[PDB]
Amino acid sequence: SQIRQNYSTEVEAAVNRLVNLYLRASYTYLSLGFYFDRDDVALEGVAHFFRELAEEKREGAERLLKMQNQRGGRALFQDLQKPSQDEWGTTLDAMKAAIVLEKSLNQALLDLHALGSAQADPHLCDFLESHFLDEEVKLIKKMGDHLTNIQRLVGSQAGLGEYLFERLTLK
Amino acid sequence: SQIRQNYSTEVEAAVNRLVNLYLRASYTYLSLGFYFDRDDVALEGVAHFFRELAEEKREGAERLLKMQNQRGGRALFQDLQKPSQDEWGTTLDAMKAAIVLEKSLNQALLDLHALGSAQADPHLCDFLESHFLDEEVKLIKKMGDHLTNIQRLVGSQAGLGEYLFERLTLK
Amino acid sequence: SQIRQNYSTEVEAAVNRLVNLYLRASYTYLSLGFYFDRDDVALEGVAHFFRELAEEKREGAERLLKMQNQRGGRALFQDLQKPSQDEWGTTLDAMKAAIVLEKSLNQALLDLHALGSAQADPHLCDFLESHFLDEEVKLIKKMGDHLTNIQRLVGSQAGLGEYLFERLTLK
Amino acid sequence: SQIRQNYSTEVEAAVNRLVNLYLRASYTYLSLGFYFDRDDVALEGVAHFFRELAEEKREGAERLLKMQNQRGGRALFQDLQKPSQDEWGTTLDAMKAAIVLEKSLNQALLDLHALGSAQADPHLCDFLESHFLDEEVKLIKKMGDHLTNIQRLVGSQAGLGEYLFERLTLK
Amino acid sequence: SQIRQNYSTEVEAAVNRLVNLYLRASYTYLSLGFYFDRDDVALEGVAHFFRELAEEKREGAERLLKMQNQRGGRALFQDLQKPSQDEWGTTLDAMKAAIVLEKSLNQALLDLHALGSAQADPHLCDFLESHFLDEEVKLIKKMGDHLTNIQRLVGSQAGLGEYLFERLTLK
Ligand SMILES: [Pd+2]
Ligand SMILES: [Pd+2]
Ligand SMILES: [Pd+2]
Ligand SMILES: [Pd+2]
Ligand SMILES: [Pd+2]
């Protein structure tokens, strides 16, 4: 590289790790998306919600990789761990798992921003805010809103509430 | 016929039987369709679902008959057995009966494809795949999805669940 | 599942393995795509070629997963092995690696088709032909065409030939 | 025939021979066209050039046959000799072979025109000029132009020159 | 000024210096742009590339001056040093000089951002990121990409490579 400037080896490594985290998250959402498409689950709005998230996280990884090259860093890929579950339970179980996942990505972004601040790397810190940190806050708020509505619908008839949420809130 | 080539008498007979099965299935769906239009049943989305299926199965029979003539075989019609029930119970009962019916048609198609493979009749085997086997897989998946949603809606208030499914999923 | 019919456990497992192979191939093409975007490589047409392939292979995996659910099988994900190289050499080296990769996917599809034929599963065999086997033949022919043109351009001035191929054949 | 007038048996026979020559030329160009589409040759602009010529020569034969009937002569077909080569070498080799072929067709047209002049058959002589002799002069000039550019591109790097000609002059 | 708030004399002075650096860079690119328009150089795509950069850097200076006034600081102009060379050598020489120039501007922006961070001036730091630091990263990546392609084209025939790069990559 003849372009690298103010781009630390620590940040370069952390960016590669964040790419792996984003790709893992995409893979997790892919699994969630197909689980809700199972004939014995059959909640299309829920499937669509997670399938859209799979694509968003893949896009996030690609944006990070583009930035790595723009800065003169070098992409290094690692194995992608399979998702933590094969079956994801109820919509409530899935939304809880999704919020946990998003909080972990958000924390990884915050950790990287902190490293950028420590390294005096303003291009990095601003890139993370613009493309990632703002989107995370919005997504987490939406999931929290969803969790609240799912929870209020459990009542004594969980099946009815699960159907209604998918029909009236999602897709 | 001056056109028949590679078209066995076994396949010709099996095609005629499949026509009868398709016409029977259309007749069954016609009965289902009008049952759900009864003033004391009154589930329009369910009626429409079965009425559409009646037309699809009739169309399938006509396609088989066209193919029979294209191959130089001769259509032979048999009596059409009246449907197995006069009254079809709940939406759940009806969807269960519809899945059973579709699985029987699918098995008849698979049996015919096997005969085509045994007879080295690739035009037949491909015709069945293109117009029938793919459609069956899609339809059966949709019915399974429907059954799952119907089942989750039973709860303690079957009437409420039946109304909601018709209103929010169907027609 | 209340829909599964004529869908063997052997095929279901093989479909899950093929999904992993497609996702691995997508990951490989993602790496190839970003390698050619490096400031010290800088062959945009080559990067774009591999980035498009990454998306095609991801789409292929998603189609396989949709089919798995349509048949009543259950998606099971495994770890995704990181790509075989971190740096991909010349356009020629990369195109050779891509052809090798495509031949491996093609062989996996052929192996699965053979299993489908052995299991008398015509829906599976036709699905593979329509969405995968035809596309593979076309893609492999295109890569072979590319390899030939790359090879004729090496001459005594490899740099010149590499630039011209990217400029005049690709993107 | 109740229409034949001023149309000699010599011309009628020569027209049938010219049809055979045109059909042979079409067959030759068909072979050339597919040779350049081989994955180990892969020069699309060259393939397209010869494929277009195959269609032009076929069209020429059909025009001659229409004229034969317009004059009250009778089409008589002979075997079509397979093309002189199975593999056509370089673009230069192929263009040289194509010019040789065109000169032979041009000479056959000139020989027929001479026969028409000898037989005082002005409809024939004008038909040949309008549909064939003018087109031949234009095509031969274009091939000569191509040969010159191909030849100047050989240099010390034949592969580079062959690629550039296909990319920058053809299709 | 009745508007100045949180705007240090150190930042105000540094902004004036950055204006001078931007105007100097514009002047350098103006010289580069006209050099490549010389009849004995005659590389229009290269001239256009540098002429566009001259305008971009002038625009950058004007944006800085507008910001200085928005904050209540006072523009102070200094002499503009003539560019470091009268003749710029090859496209490769020029692109190397341009990357050096951009890295110096980028470092000046980073130094100013650091001063803004030290002075707790978030309006300044964000202004620099938005209008300057992001653009610099993109421009430097593009120049690095260009340098790589120029370098691969040198081979044994520098003239040929220089012509091809101007024709096929630039303007
Ligand atoms: Pd920061
Ligand atoms: Pd078959
Ligand atoms: Pd098959
Ligand atoms: Pd004449
Ligand atoms: Pd700041």
Swiss-Prot record, chains A, B, C, D, E:
Domain of life: Eukaryota
Annotated spans, Catalytic site for iron oxidation: 52-59
Positions of the Ferritin-like diiron domain: 5-154
Protein name: Ferritin light chain
Swiss-Prot/TrEMBL keywords: Acetylation, Cytoplasm, Cytoplasmic vesicle, Iron, Iron storage, Lysosome, Metal-binding
Main localization (coarse): cytoplasm
UniProt GO cellular component terms: autolysosome; autophagosome; cytoplasm; cytoplasmic vesicle; ferritin complex
A single GO molecular function term of this UniProt record: iron ion binding
Lineage summary: Eukaryota, Metazoa, Chordata, Craniata, Vertebrata
Note: In horse spleen the light chain is the major chain.
Annotated source species: Equus caballus
Disulfide pairings: none
Location relative to the cell: Cytoplasmic vesicle, Autophagosome; Cytoplasm; Autolysosome
Described purpose of this protein according to its UniProt entry: Stores iron in a soluble, non-toxic, readily available form. Important for iron homeostasis. Iron is taken up in the ferrous form and deposited as ferric hydroxides after oxidation. Also plays a role in delivery of iron to cells. Mediates iron uptake in capsule cells of the developing kidney. Delivery to lysosomes by the cargo receptor NCOA4 for autophagic degradation and release or iron.
UniProt record similarity statement: Belongs to the ferritin family.
Gene that encodes it: FTL
PANTHER family hit by this protein: FERRITIN, FERRITIN LIGHT CHAIN
Binding site for Fe cation: E52, E55, E56, E59, E62
Biological process annotations from GO: intracellular iron ion homeostasis; iron ion transport
Keyword tRNA-binding: no
Subunit architecture: Oligomer of 24 subunits. There are two types of subunits: L (light) chain and H (heavy) chain. The major chain can be light or heavy, depending on the species and tissue type. The functional molecule forms a roughly spherical shell with a diameter of 12 nm and contains a central cavity into which the insoluble mineral iron core is deposited. Interacts with NCOA4.
